[PDB]
Design a protein around this ligand. Structure first.
Ligand SMILES: NC(=O)C1=CN([C@@H]2O[C@H](COP(=O)(O)OP(=O)(O)OC[C@H]3O[C@@H](n4cnc5c(N)ncnc54)[C@H](O)[C@@H]3O)[C@@H](O)[C@H]2O)C=CC1
Ligand SMILES: Cc1cc2nc3c(=O)[nH]c(=O)nc-3n(C[C@H](O)[C@H](O)[C@H](O)COP(=O)(O)O)c2cc1C
Ligand code: SF4
Ligand code: FES
Lengths: 433, 217, 62
């Protein structure tokens, strides 16, 4: 029975992050026990073209949140050298509210990330790898440094990594509390000692990146799966999920659920099945569900009527007008002030804007003020359409995608809970004459 | 809401260019190691780690520390001022011995983080911008700490204390001010991002090196 | 107040080309000076030059 049409239950043998909960030693010995750093020399001696082909045929899409096809992106950096060095920059900022996957990947099995850095650098012909870890993740960064030291002493990286005759270094760079530094160009600017302000594209990082050198920015989850994909092949990974939604994924379920947790599951698993299987179900029963944010704060919220059959992949969630993003599930029950949560998200985005460009810098603060007034109910119903137009103006007119991540949540709120805003304004008007 | 901290520096007897600051020799060796991580033509890349090291040695960042870093790295002082004002982990004012930061973002907020905030406020007698008169506790509100699954969560002196209830943070404060080191992590017998009960996945033993390695490799 | 005695202190004419102005001035009997039009020369702008690896064009701040 080819072309599976029902997904959502893969057993442990098909899981990549077998030490997700940190129940086994994360020191190099546990990684070797679990198959980490195995036959890396033979893969390294297969050449960069073979690794790029495996990543392409595996259909893997970027786990940062954009879902860009990883094979094409990594092959963008496959040009002959012109004198400048080449670098791989692994993104570990993890600033999206609701997201905790990269933290666990870094702290509980960092050797997967180190080997992914090695194989990605070989594929991209990168001289060294820079891992930009969130500054608040001090212990995680220290564990990553311990794993890096173990790899350096074991000869897995550095001069003549394994026996491939390939030289490769890994460096860990810590930020200082800035969500905007997760954006690839803002991350590059932060590495070079500047403010975390995104730069315009073109040029793309593959042509003018860190230190003006060709580089590729990749999420830690994307990097950490490439070694196992090489070992088990592109086809094994491409079997899971639907077409163009291949592979497995880490899911964070938080909010109003009985047992919030982080699990690994096949991509196209239905949202209801994931919630009631791994999170123990919505608090107070599935009939107590009000809304669910599927992929972090930047994705629009969907009502309960859509979470009955929607699948957890890029395409289905895009058809649901909500996006997959980082697969961070935030669950809000019927006891939740839906206006308050969206207003808090807009306040977060107002506090995280870098200020560089006019639409974000001004309109996000404007939306924050408008939403703060909406929470109380001081406004008039015409201000709802006004806010819709403000969000429309901001979206697509900013340097980076933070304007999108600020505009989309209010667009979803206005789309799906307009009567609540209207009745709140009515109650305030009748109370205050 | 409003920030509360100004981004204009005015000279003070406690914070002026002639305030004494200097790296220890060990910190100078660490700075050398930090600088040697970048290409030789780009030493401005070390601004962030060196500034963080100055903060770790001193506790906060006086204007003299910023000038010292700018001189060490041969960078104009305005760039160091820019970096110090842009990133919120930099303390341009003195803080307490323990910096209590509580996440008030929506995922954390949904699971009663206001209870944790009010418990801390009642136990210390200060608000979300003030400092204990003993000058050892400081309380602020932060955005999202990346540990949403465990909520509400509080980070103190670069340590995470998760799965908090008011009693948990109260005893954490008690044993912190008693000279003890509370155990970082959750306080619900969970110690990770696992489900609170059942372990609904990864129960079978993990397999060895060559479990499913493809042929021709 | 500011007083004047010459009637042409405010007279300004507009012409499409320099030749038309020269013809008008010549037929009216006035002696003239002509200044050739100044045009800003085209420039080579490069946003990527802001982040150059070895050149002095790299910018310290944005
Ligand atoms: N992991 C986390 O915690 C967070 C994730 N996000 C997600 O980030 C998403 C937006 O990210 P963006 O990078 O701005 O989207 P993007 O589509 O512009 O870029 C995605 C990747 O594809 C590459 N790319 C795109 N077009 C290319 C081209 N023509 N040539 C070469 N390379 C190209 C880019 O270099 C980039 O690395 C959001 O949807 C959000 O969900 C946002 C915040 C935090
Ligand atoms: C405001 C903003 C913040 C972001 N933060 C992160 C982050 O913290 N971690 C991450 O992996 N990607 C983040 N991204 C998306 C990056 O562009 C992404 O990491 C990069 O494209 C890597 O591509 P990949 O998904 O193929 O790995 C952020 C994007 C934006 C606009
Ligand atoms: S959209 Fe916001 S965060 Fe992005 S560059 Fe513009 S001002 Fe900065
Ligand atoms: S919402 Fe609290 S850590 Fe993200």
């Amino acid at each position: 029975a080819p072309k599976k049409t029902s997904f959502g239950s893969l057993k442990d043998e098909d899981r990549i992050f077998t030490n997700l909960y940190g129940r086994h030693d994360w020191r190099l010995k546990g990684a070797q026990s679990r198959g980490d750093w195995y036959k890396t020399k033979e893969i390294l001696l297969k050449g960069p073209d073979w690794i790029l082909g495996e990543v392409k045929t595996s259909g893997l899409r970027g786990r940062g949140g954009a879902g860009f096809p990883t094979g094409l992106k990594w092959s963008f950096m496959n040009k002959p050298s012109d004198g400048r060095p080449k670098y791989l920059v692994v993104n570990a900022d993890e600033g999206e509210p609701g997201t905790c996957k990269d933290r666990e990947i870094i702290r509980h099995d960092p050797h997967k990330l180190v080997e992914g850095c090695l194989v990605g650098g070989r594929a991209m012909g990168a001289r060294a790898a820079y891992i930009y870890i969130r500054g608040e993740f001090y212990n995680e960064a220290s564990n990553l440094q311990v794993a890096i030291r173990e790899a350096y002493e074991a000869g897995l990286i550095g001069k003549n990594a394994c026996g491939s005759g390939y030289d490769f270094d890994v460096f860990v760079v810590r930020g200082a509390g800035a969500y905007i530094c997760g954006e690839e160009t803002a991350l590059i600017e932060s590495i070079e000692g500047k403010q975390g302000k995104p730069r315009l594209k073109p040029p793309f990082p593959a042509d003018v990146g860190v230190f003006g050198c060709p580089t590729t920015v990749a999420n830690v989850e994307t990097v950490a799966v490439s070694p196992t994909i090489c070992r088990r092949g592109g086809a094994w990974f491409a079997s899971f999920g639907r077409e163009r939604n291949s592979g497995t994924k880490l899911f964070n379920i938080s909010g109003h659920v009985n047992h919030p947790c982080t699990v690994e599951e096949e991509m196209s698993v239905p949202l209801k099945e994931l919630i009631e299987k791994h999170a123990g179900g919505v608090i107070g029963g599935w009939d107590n569900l009000l809304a669910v944010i599927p992929g972090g704060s930047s994705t629009p919220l969907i009502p309960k009527s859509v979470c009955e059959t929607v699948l957890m992949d890029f395409d289905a969630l895009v058809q649901a007008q909500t996006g997959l993003g980082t697969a961070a599930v935030i669950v809000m029950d019927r006891s939740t002030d839906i206006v308050k949560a969206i207003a808090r998200l807009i306040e977060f985005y107002k506090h995280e804007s870098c200020g560089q460009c006019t639409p974000c810098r001004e309109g996000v603060d404007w939306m924050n003020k408008v939403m703060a007034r909406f929470v109380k109910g001081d406004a008039r119903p015409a201000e709802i359409d006004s806010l819709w137009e403000i969000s429309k103006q901001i979206e697509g007119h900013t340097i980076c995608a933070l304007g999108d991540g600020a505009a989309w949540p209010v667009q979803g709120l206005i789309r799906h809970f307009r009567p609540e805003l209207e009745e709140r304004m009515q109650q305030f008007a009748l109370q205050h004459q | 809401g409003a920030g509360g901290a100004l981004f204009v520096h005015r000279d003070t007897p406690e914070n002026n260019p002639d305030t004494p600051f200097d790296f220890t020799p060990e910190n100078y060796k660490r700075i050398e190691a930090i600088v040697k991580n970048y290409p030789e033509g780009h030493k401005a890349a070390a601004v962030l780690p060196v500034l963080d090291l100055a903060q770790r040695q001193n506790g906060w960042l006086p204007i003299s520390a910023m000038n010292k870093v700018a001189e060490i790295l041969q960078v104009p002082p305005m760039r160091v001022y820019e970096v110090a004002t842009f990133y919120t982990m930099y303390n341009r004012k003195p803080v307490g011995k323990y910096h209590i930061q509580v996440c008030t973002t929506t995922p954390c907020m949904l699971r009663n983080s206001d209870s944790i905030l009010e418990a801390i406020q009642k136990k210390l007698g200060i608000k979300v911008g003030e400092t204990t008169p003993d000058k050892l506790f400081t309380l602020i509100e932060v955005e999202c700490l990346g540990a949403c699954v465990n909520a509400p969560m509080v980070q103190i002196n670069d340590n995470y204390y998760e799965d908090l209830t008011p009693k948990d943070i109260e005893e954490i404060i008690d044993e912190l001010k008693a000279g003890k080191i509370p155990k970082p992590g959750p306080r619900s017998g969970r110690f990770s991002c696992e489900p609170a009960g059942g372990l609904t996945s990864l129960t079978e033993p993990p397999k060895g090196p060559g479990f499913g390695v493809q042929a021709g490799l | 107040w500011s007083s004047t005695a010459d009637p042409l202190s405010n007279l300004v004419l507009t012409f499409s080309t320099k030749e038309d102005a020269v013809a008008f001035a010549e037929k009216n009997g006035w002696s003239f000076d002509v200044e050739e039009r100044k045009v800003p020369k085209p420039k080579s702008k490069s946003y990527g030059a802001n982040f150059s690896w070895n050149k002095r064009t790299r910018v310290s701040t944005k």
